[PDB]
Structures are given as C-alpha cells and as structure tokens.
C-alpha cells in the first residue's frame, strides 16, 4: 500500500501569532500547474494534520514572518498545544523564513500535529506556514 | 523497486546570485570516503534535478552565503514558477540557510531548481545543495 503523508500550508492568508494557538493551514495542493491534494491516509483539519495509521513519521515545518522589538519561538505539538515535541523548535529574533529540523516520531491513530507559538515578544505576523508529515515505517520492534 | 532520488550540490565553486538564475549544482557524490553518485531515476542537469518517474517527492535545499539581503525559492520547470513553502532568506562571515521539506506531486520531466527572487548587495553563494527523494508512487485512483 502507500505511505501515509500530508502537506498542509498557508501561502495566501497572513495571520498574527497567538500563544499556544495552532497556526491556520488551509491548503494541501502546492503544485501550481497540476493542483492535487498532497494527502494520503492523513487528515488536514484546518490547523494541523491528524494521523490515521500507526507508524514512524518524519514531521517538520516552515514559517515566513513579516518582521518590523519582535520575536517568536515555535514548536510542534502532539494533540494539545502545550504538549510540545522535542527537537521541533524554531525561533525568530522584510520577510524572513525559518525551517525546523526533521523529527522522527512514533505516532498513533487520532494524533493531531500542530504548529504552536510558545513565546512571543511584540506582534508576530505569520506571512506563510507549512507542515510536513510523512510515514517512514510501520511500527517497529522495541522494549 | 527502489525510490527515485537525487542529491546535487556545489561545495567548491562559489557563484554570485542573479535574479531568476538557477544555481549551479555540479556534484552528485557527497560521501568523502566512498564517493558514488547519489542519483537514482532522476537527472542532475547542472543547475537542478529533473524527475523521471511520477510520484510524491520531498524537495528541499541549503545554501551558504557570504544593507544586503537574499531571498531564494525552489522553482518548478521555469524559474519564476516558485513553489510555496520553499523560501530561504538572509538579511544583514558565511551564513547557512536551510529550506523546509516540501511534499509535492511531480511528473516525468519536472525540473526542480534553486532560484534567487530578491537580491540587495553582493550575494555570493559559497555552497548550495538540492535534495529530491520519492515518498510515494502516485496516490490517485
């Protein structure tokens, strides 16, 4: 069968960051010529990606901030915004772009992956954002 | 069946950026010990990677760069045709930038390139690298 995956993004509706408020991600179709949903066995819920299939996933994200003091820190969260995932931090301290690392993680059916601001100084204008979820494996053996 | 993939980079030949000019990527063998091309069912054309098999791919890139500013995106087939989520930016020693990982449907022939979209000052690209790897066969019915 095919791996589970999803790509959910915002390229055309800026949003102000709010503490522990998931970023809006309304789009799933990044190809400008052949526009198709880049979703398979995940659900793009409007502000994140819900897992349908147990497995090991790669998760990561991007942001573009319209900077004018202004600072932000962001993480990925698991199910609720406070439940942040280690290795998923980004920070910002003209449009500037930030990208997270790639986190490998065991996820389960119903898990909801979101991008959340955890620290904000001044007003932070999110010009764009994108969340990447892709299955790398079935659940593996461990003790 | 193996996934399609390619890794094309420049580590040793700096280039001055210009608007909408794809960056040169002459190398495909990143391992310094066991130096082999990291290319399977893609083509490294000299300034990007061309897809040969339809599928969902992850695409991403890096740059090393030496008021001045530089903005870059990935483009699909033609330089102006930039891909959402693929921005990198440097606004002011060598500075490293990395894109996110974009998942996107690509068809045979699609050519992924790194392009500058905004430049102020002298932007010297000391190094660049483009990563393309197939996630899935097409997921349509």
């Amino acid at each position: 069968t095919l791996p589970a995956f999803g790509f959910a993004f915002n390229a055309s509706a800026p949003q102000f960051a709010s503490l522990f408020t998931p970023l809006l991600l309304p789009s799933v179709s990044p190809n400008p010529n052949i526009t198709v949903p880049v979703i398979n066995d995940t659900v793009s819920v409007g502000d994140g990606i819900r897992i349908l299939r147990a497995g090991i996933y790669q998760i990561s994200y991007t942001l573009t901030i319209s900077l004018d003091p202004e600072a932000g820190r962001f993480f990925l969260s698991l199910n609720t915004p406070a439940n942040i995932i280690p290795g998923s931090g980004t920070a910002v301290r003209g449009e500037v772009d930030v990208s997270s690392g790639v986190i490998l993680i065991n996820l389960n059916p119903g898990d909801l992956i979101q991008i959340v601001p955890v620290e904000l100084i001044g007003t932070v204008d999110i010009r764009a954002a994108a969340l990447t979820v892709a299955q790398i494996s079935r659940p593996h053996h461990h003790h | 069946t193996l996934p399609a993939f390619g890794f094309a980079f420049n580590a040793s030949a700096p280039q001055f950026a210009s608007l909408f000019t794809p960056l040169l990527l002459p190398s495909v063998s990143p391992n310094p010990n066991i130096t082999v091309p990291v290319i399977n069912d893609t083509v490294s054309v000299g300034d990007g990677i061309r897809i040969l098999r339809a599928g969902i791919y992850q695409i991403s890139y890096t740059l090393t760069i030496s008021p001045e500013a530089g903005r870059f995106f990935l483009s699909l087939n033609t330089p102006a045709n930039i891909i959402p989520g693929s921005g990198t930016a440097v606004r002011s020693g060598e500075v490293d930038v990395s894109s996110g990982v974009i998942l996107i449907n690509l068809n045979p022939g699609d050519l992924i390139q790194i392009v500058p979209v905004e430049l102020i000052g002298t932007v010297d690209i000391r190094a660049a690298a483009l990563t393309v790897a197939q996630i899935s066969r097409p997921h349509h019915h």
Binding site: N31, I34, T35, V36, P37, I39 | A54, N105, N107, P108, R137, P138, H139, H140, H141
Partner: peptide, 11 residues
C-alpha cells in the same frame, strides 16, 4: 506511462 493530471481522482 503514469502522470498526475487535472483528471486524477482522489478520495
């Protein structure tokens, strides 16, 4: 030959 298209069907 397999290709994505505007006619491609999803769930």
């Amino acid at each position: 030959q397999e290709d994505f298209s505007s006619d491609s069907s999803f769930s």
